[PDB]
Design a protein around this ligand. Sequence first.
Ligand SMILES: CS(=O)(=O)NCc1ccc(Cl)cc1
Length: 282
Amino acid sequence: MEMEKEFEQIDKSGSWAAIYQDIRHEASDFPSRVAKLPKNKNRNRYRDVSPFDHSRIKLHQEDNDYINASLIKMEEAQRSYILTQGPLPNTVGHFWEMVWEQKSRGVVMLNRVMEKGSLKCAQYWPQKEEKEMIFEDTNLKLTLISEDIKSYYTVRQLELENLTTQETREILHFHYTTWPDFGVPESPASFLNFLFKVRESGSLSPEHGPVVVHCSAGIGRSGTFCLADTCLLLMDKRKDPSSVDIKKVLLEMRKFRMGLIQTADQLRFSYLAVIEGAKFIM
Ligand SMILES: CS(=O)(=O)NCc1ccc(Cl)cc1
C-alpha cells in the first residue's frame, strides 16, 4: 500500500502495536559473540543492545578492537551510517578513535547528557574554547572552535588532532536538544528541519566517511533518523515514489543492527516524518 493512506488505515484501526510486533518477529538474528566476551562488559551500556559480529566497527588496535557500533550500508539509496551508543566514561577515547579512523565529518547526537534525572551518556566534548580535552588512551586532542545555539538544536565546530601525526580535522557536532523525556514529538517539523541541516553540511555525502549517529542505546531515536533520511532519498531516486515501503526499509536496516525503532510510537512518528517531508521536498 501507499504510505499516507496505510497510515490513516492503521490510525483508524488502532493497530500500531500489532504492526510493530510483526516487524519484531520478522527481524534478523545474527551472532554478537565479540560484544559478549567478558573483557568487554564495561564497553556496553545495556546488556540487551549489542552490535552483530558481521557489521560491527573495528578499532585499529591489536589489544582490543571492540566498540558498541554498527555500519548500516544502504545499497539502493547509496548512503552509509554508523549507529552507536552514547559514550561511557571508559569509552570516550574509543569513540573519537572511531571518528578519526572512519574519516567521518559529522556526529549526530539525539539525546541530552541527563534525562529523567539520570546520566544517558558521558560529557564527551569540551564546553569552553579555552578548556580542551585530551584522551590519553587513544592519543587524541579535541577543541571547541565555535557553537551556535538555536531553539531546537545546537551546532558545534570541533577540531580533532591526532597527536601521533599532528594531523588535524574539522568535525561538525549536530545536537538535537528537544526530544521529550517521554514519548515522541507531537510534530515532525523540527526533526525534519534538523535532518536537512545535517544534509546541507555535507556530513552525509560520499566524499566523507559515514556519519556517526547516537542516542543513549543507539537504536531508537537513532533508528528514526536514518530510516527517515533513507526513505526520503529513495522517494527522490525512484520513478514511482509511492513504491517506497517503510516497513521493508526498516527490516533491511535491522540486518545491520538489532532493535532499530524501540516502540510503536517511534514507528508511527517515523511514518509521520517521511509523509510530511515528502511534501516539502517538492
Ligand atoms: C544469537 S545467535 O547468533 O546465537 N543466534 C541467531 C540465529 C538466528 C537464526 C538461526 Cl536459524 C540461528 C541462529
